Design a protein around this ligand. Structure first.
Ligand SMILES: [Zn+2]
Ligand SMILES: [Zn+2]
Ligand SMILES: [Zn+2]
Ligand SMILES: [Zn+2]
Lengths: 72, 72
DNA sequence: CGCCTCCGGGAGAGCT
DNA sequence: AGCTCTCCCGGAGGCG
C-alpha cells in the first residue's frame, strides 16, 4: 500500500520497488535527464508527500537505496 | 468497439488493426513463433470469441488479411 | 513536478 | 509440454 521512498499510497511495483506514481516518474526523469542534484542540508532530508519536492537529491538517494533500477 | 479478427470487444489498435487483447498477443506469438499452422477444415473456419482457439491457421490468416503487421 | 492516455510486451495461471 | 489470455508495468507523448 505504501511507497518505499515517500510513503504516499503506492501505485504498483515500479523499477523494482513498491512505489507511488510520482516517484516512478521522478526516478525515470532523474536517471534519463542526468540531472545532478545537490542537498542543501545534511544528506538526511525528510522525503514525504509534503517535502519530496524540496530535495530531489535525497529523494533520488532514497530511490537508489530502495533498489530502483531502470532496467529491473 | 469490435475486434476486426474475432469480433470480441476490441481493446484498441494493436499492430495496425483495431483488435482485442488476445488477438494482439496471439498474432505477435504467431509471427515470431515461425509457425506451421494447418487448418483441419478447409481454410474457412469461423473466428469468433468462442471459436478463435480452434484454428490458429485461420486466425493468423485472418490477422494478416486484416492488415496486422509487426511494424506499426 | 504529477498526471493523463495509448499501445507494446513480460509473466504466470490455467487449460489442453 | 504448448497455447491462451488477463494482469501488470514499460515507454512515448502530451498537459496543466
Ligand atoms: Zn513515492
Ligand atoms: Zn537533502
Ligand atoms: Zn480478437
Ligand atoms: Zn481453419
Amino acid at each position: 500500500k505504501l511507497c518505499l521512498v515517500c510513503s504516499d499510497e503506492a501505485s504498483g511495483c515500479h523499477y523494482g520497488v513498491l512505489t507511488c506514481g510520482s516517484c516512478k516518474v521522478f526516478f525515470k526523469r532523474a536517471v534519463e535527464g542526468q540531472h545532478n542534484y545537490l542537498c542543501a542540508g545534511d544528506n538526511r532530508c525528510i522525503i514525504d508527500k509534503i517535502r519530496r519536492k524540496n530535495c530531489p537529491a535525497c529523494r533520488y538517494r532514497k530511490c537508489l537505496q530502495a533498489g530502483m533500477n531502470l532496467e529491473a
